[PDB]
Amino acid sequence: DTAVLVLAAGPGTRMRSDTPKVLHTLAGRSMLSHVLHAIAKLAPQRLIVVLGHDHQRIAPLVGELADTLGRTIDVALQDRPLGTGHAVLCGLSALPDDYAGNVVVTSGDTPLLDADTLADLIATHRAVSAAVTVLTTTLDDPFGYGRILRTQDHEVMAIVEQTDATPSQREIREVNAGVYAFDIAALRSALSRLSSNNAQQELYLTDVIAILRSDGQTVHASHVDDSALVAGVNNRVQLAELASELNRRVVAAHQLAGVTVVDPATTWIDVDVTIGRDTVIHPGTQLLGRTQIGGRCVVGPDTTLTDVAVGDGASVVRTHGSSSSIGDGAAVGPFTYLRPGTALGADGKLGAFVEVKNSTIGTGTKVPHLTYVGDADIGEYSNIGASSVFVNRTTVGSHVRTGSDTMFVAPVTIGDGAYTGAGTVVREDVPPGALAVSAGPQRNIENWVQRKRPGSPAAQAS
Amino acid sequence: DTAVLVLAAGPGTRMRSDTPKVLHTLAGRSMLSHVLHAIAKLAPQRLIVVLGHDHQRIAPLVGELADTLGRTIDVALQDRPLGTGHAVLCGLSALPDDYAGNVVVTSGDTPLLDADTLADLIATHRAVSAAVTVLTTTLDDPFGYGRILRTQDHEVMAIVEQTDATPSQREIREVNAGVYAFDIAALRSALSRLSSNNAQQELYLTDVIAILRSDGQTVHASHVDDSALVAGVNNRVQLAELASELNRRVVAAHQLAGVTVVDPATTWIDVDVTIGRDTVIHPGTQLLGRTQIGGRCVVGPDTTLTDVAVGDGASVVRTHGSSSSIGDGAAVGPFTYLRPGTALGADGKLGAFVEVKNSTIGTGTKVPHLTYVGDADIGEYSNIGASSVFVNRTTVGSHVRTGSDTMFVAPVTIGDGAYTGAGTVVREDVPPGALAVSAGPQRNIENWVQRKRPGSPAAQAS
Amino acid sequence: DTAVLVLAAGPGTRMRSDTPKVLHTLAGRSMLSHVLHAIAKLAPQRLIVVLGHDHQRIAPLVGELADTLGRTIDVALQDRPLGTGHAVLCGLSALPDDYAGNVVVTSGDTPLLDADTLADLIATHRAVSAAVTVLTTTLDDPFGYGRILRTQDHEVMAIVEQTDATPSQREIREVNAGVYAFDIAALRSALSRLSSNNAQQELYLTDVIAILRSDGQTVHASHVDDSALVAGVNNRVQLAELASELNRRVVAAHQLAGVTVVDPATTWIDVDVTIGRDTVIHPGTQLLGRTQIGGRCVVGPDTTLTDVAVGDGASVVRTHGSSSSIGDGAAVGPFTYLRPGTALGADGKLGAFVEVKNSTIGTGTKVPHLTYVGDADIGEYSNIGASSVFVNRTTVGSHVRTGSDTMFVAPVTIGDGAYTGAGTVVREDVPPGALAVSAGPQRNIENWVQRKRPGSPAAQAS
Ligand SMILES: CC(=O)N[C@H]1[C@@H](OP(=O)(O)OP(=O)(O)OC[C@H]2O[C@@H](n3ccc(=O)[nH]c3=O)[C@H](O)[C@@H]2O)O[C@H](CO)[C@@H](O)[C@@H]1O
Ligand SMILES: CC(=O)N[C@H]1[C@@H](OP(=O)(O)OP(=O)(O)OC[C@H]2O[C@@H](n3ccc(=O)[nH]c3=O)[C@H](O)[C@@H]2O)O[C@H](CO)[C@@H](O)[C@@H]1O
Numbered sequence A, B, C: 001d002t003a004v005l006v007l008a009a010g011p012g013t014r015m016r017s018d019t020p021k022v023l024h025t026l027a028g029r030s031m032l033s034h035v036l037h038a039i040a041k042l043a044p045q046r047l048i049v050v051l052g053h054d055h056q057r058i059a060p061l062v063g064e065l066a067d068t069l070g071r072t073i074d075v076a077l078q079d080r081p082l083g084t085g086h087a088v089l090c091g092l093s094a095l096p097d098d099y100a101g102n103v104v105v106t107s108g109d110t111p112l113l114d115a116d117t118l119a120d121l122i123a124t125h126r127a128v129s130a131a132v133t134v135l136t137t138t139l140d141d142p143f144g145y146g147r148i149l150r151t152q153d154h155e156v157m158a159i160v161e162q163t164d165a166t167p168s169q170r171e172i173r174e175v176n177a178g179v180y181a182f183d184i185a186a187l188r189s190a191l192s193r194l195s196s197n198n199a200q201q202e203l204y205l206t207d208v209i210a211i212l213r214s215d216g217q218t219v220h221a222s223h224v225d226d227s228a229l230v231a232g233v234n235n236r237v238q239l240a241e242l243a244s245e246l247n248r249r250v251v252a253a254h255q256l257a258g259v260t261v262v263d264p265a266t267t268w269i270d271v272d273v274t275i276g277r278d279t280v281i282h283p284g285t286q287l288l289g290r291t292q293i294g295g296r297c298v299v300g301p302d303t304t305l306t307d308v309a310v311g312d313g314a315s316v317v318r319t320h321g322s323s324s325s326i327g328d329g330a331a332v333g334p335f336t337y338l339r340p341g342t343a344l345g346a347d348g349k350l351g352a353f354v355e356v357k358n359s360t361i362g363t364g365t366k367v368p369h370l371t372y373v374g375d376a377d378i379g380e381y382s383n384i385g386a387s388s389v390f391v392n393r394t395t396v397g398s399h400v401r402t403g404s405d406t407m408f409v410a411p412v413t414i415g416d417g418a419y420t421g422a423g424t425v426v427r428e429d430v431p432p433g434a435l436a437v438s439a440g441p442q443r444n445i446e447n448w449v450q451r452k453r454p455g456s457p458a459a460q461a462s
């Protein structure tokens, strides 16, 4: 029986943001959402998020997150940010007075923490019969962390905050993860003895460690060797670094599973993205939101895809796209823009300097050059000539061949197997197998250049 | 006198690929091709590649590689992957029974190994009169490697595989390179004593070390300080990391030789690419295949070039191109697509949102905006107006000026110094110095907007 | 009272460049300009730059740099590169014979050196009453540096150059920064005792250390813990690495100040660039020259901006731009090219495959597709249809709607609230609220396809 508290009621002033700290994203989820996803998988009996000033904005998200995860998450309010010890007290209030289970506390800014590390904590806690067990780690750069103070016999004495530490303390590299397990009575008891006479004038949760030692209670430090699993984010430097570490882990799982990633340093893949066996990812690529790539694809350099479904054997090169689907063996790019609701059939082609929006394009149909396709539906095995525009609903059939420089003025229907000559403004329906035209005939004006640009380099008409 | 065996008969199941392990690429060559290029430069008397299941696909490449290198490379078959000891035995069979030379063995997955490290091996082997000499190195992360076991007096006792190692072994950081020299008789003798009673039930080549020690033969470990020269690739994580290390070495040689590379981390250069003095490479660039860049070029950000010749003093910015040539002082980009067979003359310009395919464009001719050029030949000092299309063979002469929105309907010839008015569909030949037109005249319809869009913001025609 | 010498008279042959070493750039300034900016902020009484062969090119820049900084910088000439000791002697000559102040010497190739490190030097020098104080640091890779030789009692004895060092020396990791403070008389005295009998046959400034020790003068080494502040650049490998370190520091200051940078490794920001609170920078971005971004912007992936002003709340995605301004809440990109003199009003849009040059575009006006805008002025709340061209001065008013495929043949004026039909060549002025047209009417040719492409897939007109 376990209750988990997530402290998320801090101001987050070190982020320098009008967006609440806990809502800043990495790999496609807010920090808060990474933290709640980890804990949901542990399924504690109770789950409590402490909110503060920003509560009106954060509480709804947490609401949505609880439906997604199919459990109840309670919200407890901390009206002023009096410190992490004060934040725990606020959390406990949403538990019954007689609650007997263990209490786990973690922060809203520790976004790589995972169900495993959580479960190892709880087991260690029950195993050693600890009143408090605290996760620790060691780091080349311990700045801004609580430091772990041990006695001569390796006993944990206390945790000392960065602001409160001696210059000699501070050199300590074993750090506080800010993830704890407590016996609830021991914990209620220690919180009442907290005073705020320290460098920041706050009620520090970390002071509970020395307080329980006073009472001769058992204090256990549980070292986590993978430091990143418990790294915190307090500013945008630490956010980006953890984003970068998380992204390497995600790239690696995909490589181990059969994806070639030429350049992981410049390949960003969100947490929910799937990729098929033997696809190749070239440098400078972001695969974002719920993007899915099938097998044996080529995802070319300099491509950004957000919520795009790409089938097997497709090629997607220097393309910027969202909410769109691209079929098996289709060719997209280079220099192509897909806007939401684009659906490209299997073996379709969207080519260089082509933009598509809210349009359906059938099997094997090609839109290869310099064209805009908006609010249109196109059949199968059709060819849309270069430098054309769908001027926004237009229906084009199958096996159609439209000529370069055609403007399709919505709404207009072009029948199966119809043609359009180069330079046509289509304003009326075109029967199947008709040719539609509008351009006047060529006239050559002889010796225009001698007459109207005399002495120019072009009077090499001589 | 030396025979070199390359073991390439493993399944490669850890790559998770339907492409044979040894064919996966880095910097423009398969691993197998990196390995054979290194060994060819050593010119041993005999060179033997052990192939397995995938033999029908690999043997032809090796054939092609032997012509390229002007030597014979034999292929020996290993029908089932019984282990690296079994693979050696298969290799030896393609040598005569009386062969007396030393035998060098290396893997198909050690792609940075070089002629030097090979030659230092052979010399050390002859110098210490060793029955076996094995290349070793030491690593922060030794996972998946054979570990070197030494006696109290620093003597090599044995090599222990990752799967077979004690937890205490495993902490060993001195690792087996899998590159060996052997006395042939000692080697034939040890292979016959191999048994497969180990964690993977395989005949391990590494067991030969302990076996020859048994017989009181001389065993020598030769430490290679540059770990990368002997790193192996077993999965796509290790492939990409070695690709990244190789690419730094290649970038550096070019910098030492007079190329500015603003951002080596995001500059990928293949092994055969050449670059001239004082050229500048901006971030996000791939230079691929047999690409050659002259001196004082600017190769702009976000450019990918595969088999492109670029002369001196040219500028190539945000361009995606292959099998094309670009002359001295030409300007290409940003946002330009070159398809195969594009040849741009000196001082030519291909501009933003321009695509060129199988076309020749003469000295100083400019195609600067929004245009498609396919299957055409263009003379010198010509100007192709914006938003034009070569609708696919068309010949345009020199000092020509074509107007915006011209469609050139192949096949058509435009004489020297000719002009085209804006909006012309060219279907017939244009004499030198003629002006060709087709567009009807402008008509203004007065107060159309009051009439046909009443109350719209545009009835600020008032 | 202090005189600062910057030695910049070396050939720089290791750069392999026809551009003088000291002019090579990082983050938007030459090395020489980084060095003089640091020293100006210290405001010594005298500031002397030693120039050599390349003097005619470098002296003017230094001239310009002295006006920018509002002080006088003298130039002293060193006619042949006899060594760094000889270079100091040349510098001293531009000081009066009776000069009594301390002399600071630093190199032209130490581009991260800062006013602070300089000031700590001078204070340490005055504090210990040193005849010479030398800045040192320690490094994993000391190659190519002078090594610091200390006695048994930790006393600095001498500095030994890379070329002159024993193999055992060379293993020394404490290195010479090449930044010194001297007592002037001690310094004049030591320089006269220098001889050039060493591996490079040069008069080495570093030899002054052992020489003053001989005379029992006080020699002090002042260790700089941040190694980068005193790293030198001798080749393009060392240039790019220091560029990369400098760029991380600059990215970090912006993150600490409230800018999200998703991927610092691939975000290049010049030293003078400013960025507002809560803007987001996506990967593959260069912000260059005097670029200014306001708050809450999105600066999308794959964007390069040089001297561009972007207001608050704007979006600038896959855009290549220079000398242009983009207003509050405007949308630019993806795949957009801004050329100099582009001014986009607030809430304006420039879209995919759009190029703009020397044009003014008013509040809320949209140019969203496939268009070229050159030498034109456009009013407010106007819409420029797709695939259009401004054929170069043209004036378009406000609330105008122009149709797809319109060519505007300069010079032409389009009145407020006017329209253009699809496919119009505008050669004459269009009154306010008129509709201008030129395209002929659509003709359908029935069963053209049966007749003129019999048996083709398009005769699915059946
Ligand atoms: C005193 C304390 O706890 N310090 C720990 C805290 O430092 P740190 O300085 O990181 O403390 P923070 O201010 O980030 O707060 C921790 C978490 O508690 C929340 N919060 C904070 C104050 C408050 O009044 N209410 C509230 O709900 C914050 O939103 C944050 O999610 O985390 C570090 C590791 O990540 C530890 O090494 C420190 O020992
Ligand atoms: C037992 C053995 O040799 N292990 C070595 C092997 O481990 P590793 O586990 O890398 O062994 P691999 O399976 O990669 O095989 C080595 C090479 O031999 C080939 N092959 C393998 C099995 C087979 O039946 N036939 C065959 O031809 C493979 O294609 C590969 O090219 O390389 C490592 C370094 O890179 C060493 O540290 C290990 O000590």
Ligand SMILES: CC(=O)N[C@H]1[C@@H](OP(=O)(O)OP(=O)(O)OC[C@H]2O[C@@H](n3ccc(=O)[nH]c3=O)[C@H](O)[C@@H]2O)O[C@H](CO)[C@@H](O)[C@@H]1O
Pocket (backbone or CB within 6 Å): C007, C008, C009, C010, C011, C050, C078, C080, C081, C082, C083, C084, C085, C086, C087, C107, C108, C109, C110, C144, C145, C146, C147, C159, C161, C175, C176, C177, C178, C204, C205, C206, C231, C232, C233, C234
């Ligand atoms: C003998 C000497 O000084 N060596 C130092 C120099 O090595 P390093 O080998 O870097 O010496 P460089 O050749 O770069 O010269 C140093 C500076 O002095 C200038 N210059 C050089 C020669 C000359 O005749 N005239 C002249 O003006 C160069 O332009 C350069 O700006 O800098 C290193 C750190 O960066 C130090 O660790 C070395 O101890």
Ligand SMILES: [Co+2]
Pocket (backbone or CB within 6 Å): A107, A109, A232, A233, A234
């Ligand atoms: Co924190």
Ligand SMILES: [Co+2]
Pocket (backbone or CB within 6 Å): B107, B109, B232, B233, B234
């Ligand atoms: Co291997």
Ligand SMILES: [Co+2]
Pocket (backbone or CB within 6 Å): A405, A423, B405, B423, C405, C423
């Ligand atoms: Co037209």
Ligand SMILES: [Co+2]
Pocket (backbone or CB within 6 Å): C107, C109, C232, C233, C234
């Ligand atoms: Co130097």
Ligand SMILES: [Mg+2]
Pocket (backbone or CB within 6 Å): none
């Ligand atoms: Mg705080």
Ligand SMILES: [Mg+2]
Pocket (backbone or CB within 6 Å): none
């Ligand atoms: Mg295996």
Ligand SMILES: [Mg+2]
Pocket (backbone or CB within 6 Å): A387, A405, B387, B405, C387, C405
């Ligand atoms: Mg057109």
Ligand SMILES: [Mg+2]
Pocket (backbone or CB within 6 Å): none
């Ligand atoms: Mg030199």
